[PDB]
Amino acid sequence: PKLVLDLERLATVPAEKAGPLQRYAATIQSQRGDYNGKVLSIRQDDLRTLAVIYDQSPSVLTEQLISWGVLDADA
Amino acid sequence: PKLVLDLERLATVPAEKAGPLQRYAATIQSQRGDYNGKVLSIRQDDLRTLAVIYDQSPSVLTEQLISWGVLD
Ligand SMILES: Nc1nc2c(ncn2[C@@H]2O[C@@H]3COP(=O)(O)O[C@H]4[C@@H](O)[C@H](n5cnc6c(=O)[nH]c(N)nc65)O[C@@H]4COP(=O)(O)O[C@H]3[C@H]2O)c(=O)[nH]1
Ligand SMILES: Nc1nc2c(ncn2[C@@H]2O[C@@H]3COP(=O)(O)O[C@H]4[C@@H](O)[C@H](n5cnc6c(=O)[nH]c(N)nc65)O[C@@H]4COP(=O)(O)O[C@H]3[C@H]2O)c(=O)[nH]1
Ligand SMILES: Nc1nc2c(ncn2[C@@H]2O[C@@H]3COP(=O)(O)O[C@H]4[C@@H](O)[C@H](n5cnc6c(=O)[nH]c(N)nc65)O[C@@H]4COP(=O)(O)O[C@H]3[C@H]2O)c(=O)[nH]1
Ligand SMILES: Nc1nc2c(ncn2[C@@H]2O[C@@H]3COP(=O)(O)O[C@H]4[C@@H](O)[C@H](n5cnc6c(=O)[nH]c(N)nc65)O[C@@H]4COP(=O)(O)O[C@H]3[C@H]2O)c(=O)[nH]1
């Protein structure tokens, strides 16, 4: 399963919920110099680190991102 | 030193030296379905994967990769 984020839906999720995801995605973009600004695919191991940053299980985290329509239901 | 590979350069490299790396390249491109240019950039840690498959030190591998013109 692929992990693809919607950069445009993400930007409008309030910081209180999405702040740490937004900052994480920004550090990847800066490192990449990847500023397409529509979509961002991350490594499957980036999910474990986000889950730690969010303090949830990778599983709980995924379902939340999907619930926001940021992460394609494919994952 | 970032691993940006010139696939067009490496093709012209004789098979008994370029082979493993050509075949490694091709596996990565198949993993990503990345078939849109003559350049392949790979992970810095892949250097070790490669030094293992070639059974040479990273140092060695990296320096003949530059003579070959495959790397910058
Ligand atoms: N800028 C960007 N676009 C994304 C991202 N995720 C998905 N896409 C879009 O979705 C397709 C597949 O992305 P992919 O799984 O990364 O799979 C990609 C990726 O593996 C690779 N690829 C394409 N361009 C580049 C590149 O500039 N650098 C690297 N390192 N790989 C690339 O080729 C595969 C197919 O690329 P395409 O089908 O032509 O086009 C893309 C691209 O239009 C992302 O994080 N950033
Ligand atoms: N060792 C190695 N393995 C490789 C390489 N390229 C691809 N793979 C493997 O193939 C999977 C799919 O690559 P992808 O479609 O480009 O899909 C990639 C891709 O769109 C993007 N991605 C991950 N890392 C990078 C990166 O450093 N740069 C860019 N531009 N995109 C990345 O995140 C997606 C998921 O990444 P993964 O879960 O890791 O899943 C990756 C990874 O297991 C490589 O150069 N070296
Ligand atoms: N996961 C993913 N990431 C993407 C995709 N398209 C672009 N990117 C990201 O966006 C950066 C800039 O892409 P670019 O300058 O348009 O243009 C790229 C591209 O023209 C070319 N390039 C270098 N390496 C590769 C490669 O392995 N595959 C491909 N298809 N192009 C590459 O050099 C420039 C910089 O390459 P990068 O260092 O890889 O840096 C890429 C990469 O991090 C994509 O479809 N999927
Ligand atoms: N399509 C595709 N290309 C891949 C993948 N892995 C590596 N690459 C390519 O190989 C490059 C160097 O990978 P790196 O040493 O891991 O160096 C990477 C890595 O340290 C980091 N980075 C980029 N994207 C991601 C990511 O999604 N997750 C993580 N944890 N680190 C990333 O920033 C670096 C520079 O990224 P780039 O400019 O994009 O340059 C990337 C990219 O062109 C992959 O799974 N799929």
From TrEMBL, chain B:
Residues holding 3',3'-c-di-GMP 2: 2, 32, 43-44, 46
Binding site for 3',3'-c-di-GMP 1: 2, 32, 34, 36, 41
Top-level division of the source organism's lineage: Bacteria
Protein's name according to its UniProt entry: DNA-binding protein
Source organism: Streptomyces coelicolor (strain ATCC BAA-471 / A3(2) / M145)
Whole sequence portion shown: 83 to 154 of 167
